[PDB]
């Protein structure tokens, strides 16, 4: 029946990513998770009014698995490429993850979205401005995202199955 | 009726609970939340012990309390103080008569001695298992050493006593076996000779016995302290994980090299030769319950470099396609298959620990440290039952040792083993992609013709072991 | 897979501990430590099934002697240790077996009854003894050393075949 879309977010480590696909599929209004639950990592939505079913891989923790990588990647129709606003490094290193995905998959013009990820209170240090000329020069949507108000975390998912819906 | 309580004013412990300070899950209670007042009493409690609370709350309590707190804590509640004379006691005791003290005999034996035994129990347990702590305090040490020194009275003598000299111990710090371990297997590279070690040439058999014998002493060596607060994936891992990144640097390290023994294998028959002495490598680390080697090779077969060979996976054998499939399916759909054979087969295994770093660090990072309940901040313990729930787990599969022989030369030279050489990875496995494109180039390009480069003989002995008397 | 909580009891210094620390790690024990109450865990197939073993090690000194309600409550089935060089220790397993009726209100609890330290020659309490002890109790009687791992596997694993068959 419904599409199922498998989804794969991909970043630095150490820096908060996680809190996306958590907010997402949490319960939205309470702030508990079990990541053990047999399906915590699928969820129903309605998207432009069709109704799909996200199934997310989030291998947050498994960085220094670096020989992994690949295997995960080759699992995923789209990709989230996750920085912290506040880790310039994790900025840095999105350019080697696209370039990683685009041959894992084989293809030049693989679904993704590149995410500046707000996790705490320290200073930012790479600029909206910055971000937004990098998703350019790729081709890209970017979409900033807060790891504690919720803010932006629907959007990044909903922009990446609308890139694969019209890849 | 109950054991009447000091006052509340000078012993804390002794507080009724409330919603303002411990709520629990909906037979013993499950704490939800609670004050680390509320926690610790109910760690020592004096109706029944929990050694599964004790081991939670020793893994993860310093997310709430500082090691210091927690000895002045539970020497607080180990010092108890003793009700005063009865009315009977009192009339006794004015006639000339030995009172009875009913109510404090009644007391020393169902409410003191219980509730100082288990807080002993914390310390032996928190010597025993935690003794991180005081290895990176040396005065918290000499503080635990002057408590229990001074414990009087000769209910806990024994304990004491005990603890004493485990702790002694502890600062200066055998396997037997059901049967005898197999005959270590040889093939090309005889005994003694480690300048011929190498993929081929080492028995598939003693590879994969070695390769277990030292990813289940990595696994083994991984303590608590390393997981617990998602300390591997911060700027101080290397000084607060260094067991857990040997073990998946070994673990990276050992796929990179099954890539590039790979692609550095031009000849395509040859190579065939290779990707086939891989997956026996893979059936024996399956019969040993080796699922982090079992994961190290999937990786490797699943590797840029190495997925894209469609003329050496042609040439595999239909049963050895058939085996590396079968692992493939353990990883996926989120490893839902690997997860239910772990939690079938009979130990010794090698768990891979991939999947427990991930629910760690999402249990850490999905759930609040405190509830807000009535004004008051409690601490939200169901959070930390949950991480002590995964130590516990990795714990459980740490026991069991393998009854398999050491090879010290076969064990050396996987320690040593450096595939990517003074290389950075970038540079490495641009390079491993560029050999794969070399020796099998994108349609339309012409399949080329490699010379061989392996002097022996590529027939595999096979993967059945061998028995002389 | 099916958890069993097993819980191993009997007098000071007859080794409990050394037996649960040989099936849980394949270790034996040297020191006398006396426990205060310890909890281990081992995933393990017994007659081609995967089990969860819970295991209670306890405290058998006498000055822990009033703490045991609170244990024999959640056991599931009860190793009963003596030592075979300890007279004594034989003569405390019908306390041990009186008390766990009492609290689980129940006069057919699955029990093994074990007599440890069989490596040592020293004996002083008769295997005829033992075994007619056991027959008195419907239960077996198995024979252990924690150091040579002798019985070891054989009593915890009938004891959770007793669980299994209850
Ligand atoms: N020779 C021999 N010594 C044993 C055996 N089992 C235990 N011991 C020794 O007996 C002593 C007591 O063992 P232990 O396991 O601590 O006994 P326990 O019954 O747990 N004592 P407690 O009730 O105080 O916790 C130790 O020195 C231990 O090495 C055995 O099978 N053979
Ligand atoms: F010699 C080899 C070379 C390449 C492969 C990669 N690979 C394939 N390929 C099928 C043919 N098209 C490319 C993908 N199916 C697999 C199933 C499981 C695993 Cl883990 C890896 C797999 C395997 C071998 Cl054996
Ligand atoms: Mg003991
Ligand atoms: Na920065």
Request: proline letters at 6%; glycine letters at 4%.
């Amino acid at each position: 029946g419904m599409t199922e879309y498998k989804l794969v977010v991909v970043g630095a480590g150490g820096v908060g990513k996680s809190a996306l696909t958590i907010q997402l599929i949490q319960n939205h209004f309470v702030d508990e998770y079990d990541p053990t639950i047999e399906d915590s990592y699928r969820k129903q939505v309605v998207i432009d009014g069709e109704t799909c079913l996200l199934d997310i891989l989030d291998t947050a923790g498994q960085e220094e698995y670096s020989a992994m990588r690949d295997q995960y990647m080759r699992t995923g129709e789209g990709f989230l490429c996750v920085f912290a606003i506040n880790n310039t490094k994790s900025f840095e290193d999105i350019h080697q993850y696209r370039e990683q995905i685009k041959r894992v998959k084989d293809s030049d013009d693989v679904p993704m979205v590149l995410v500046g990820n707000k996790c705490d209170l320290a200073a930012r240090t790479v600029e909206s401005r910055q971000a937004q000329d990098l998703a350019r020069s790729y081709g890209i949507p970017y979409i900033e995202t807060s790891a504690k108000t919720r803010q932006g975390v629907e959007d990044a998912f909903y922009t990446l199955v609308r890139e694969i819906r019209q890849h | 009726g109950q054991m009447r309580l000091p006052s509340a004013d000078v012993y804390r412990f002794a507080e009724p609970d409330s919603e303002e300070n411990i709520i629990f899950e909906e037979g013993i209670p499950i704490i939800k939340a609670g004050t680390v007042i509320k926690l610790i009493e109910r760690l020592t409690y004096h109706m029944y012990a929990d050694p599964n609370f004790v081991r939670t709350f020793l893994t993860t309590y310093r997310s709430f309390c500082k090691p210091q707190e927690l000895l002045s804590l539970i020497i607080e509640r180990f010092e108890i103080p003793e009700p005063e004379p009865t009315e009977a006691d009192r009339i006794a005791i004015e006639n000339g008569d030995q009172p009875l003290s009913a109510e404090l005999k009644r007391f020393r034996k169902e409410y003191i001695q219980p509730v100082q035994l288990r807080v002993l129990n914390v310390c032996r347990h928190w010597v025993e298992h935690h003794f991180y702590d005081f290895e990176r305090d040396a005065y918290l040490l000499q503080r635990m050493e002057e408590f229990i020194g001074t414990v009087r009275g000769k209910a806990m003598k024994k304990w004491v006593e005990s603890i004493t000299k485990i702790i002694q111990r502890k600062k200066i710090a055998n396997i037997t076996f059901q049967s005898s371990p197999p005959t270590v297997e040889w093939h090309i590279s005889r005994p003694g000779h480690i300048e011929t070690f190498d993929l081929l040439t080492l028995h598939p058999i003693e590879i994969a016995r070695q390769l277990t014998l030292l990813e289940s002493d990595l696994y083994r060596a991984v303590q608590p302290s390393e997981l617990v607060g998602s300390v591997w994936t911060k700027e101080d891992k290397e000084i607060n994980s260094p067991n857990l990144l040997k073990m998946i640097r070994h673990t990276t390290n050992l796929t990179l090299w099954f890539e590039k023994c790979i692609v550095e294998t031009e000849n395509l028959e040859e190579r065939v030769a290779v990707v086939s002495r891989i997956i026996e490598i893979l059936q024996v680390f399956q019969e040993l319950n080796n699922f982090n080697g079992v994961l190290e090779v999937v990786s490797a077969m699943n590797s840029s470099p190495v997925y894209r060979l469609d003329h050496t996976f042609e040439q595999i054998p239909s049963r050895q396609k058939k085996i590396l499939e079968e692992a493939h399916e353990l990883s996926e759909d989120h490893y839902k298959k690997y997860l239910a054979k772990l939690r079938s087969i009979n130990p010794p295994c090698v768990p891979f620990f991939g999947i427990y770093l991930t629910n760690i660090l999402k249990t850490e990072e999905g759930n609040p440290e405190v509830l807000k309940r009535h004004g008051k901040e409690l601490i939200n313990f169901s959070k930390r039952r949950k991480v002590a729930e995964i130590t516990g787990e990795i714990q459980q599969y740490q026991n069991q040792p393998y009854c398999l022989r050491v090879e010290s030369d076969i064990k050396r030279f996987f320690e040593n083993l450096n595939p990517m050489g003074n290389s950075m990875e970038k540079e490495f496995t641009d390079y491993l992609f560029n050999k794969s494109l070399e020796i099998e180039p994108r349609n339309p390009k012409p399949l080329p013709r490699f010379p061989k480069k392996y002097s022996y003989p590529l027939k595999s002995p096979g993967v059945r072991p061998s028995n002389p008397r």
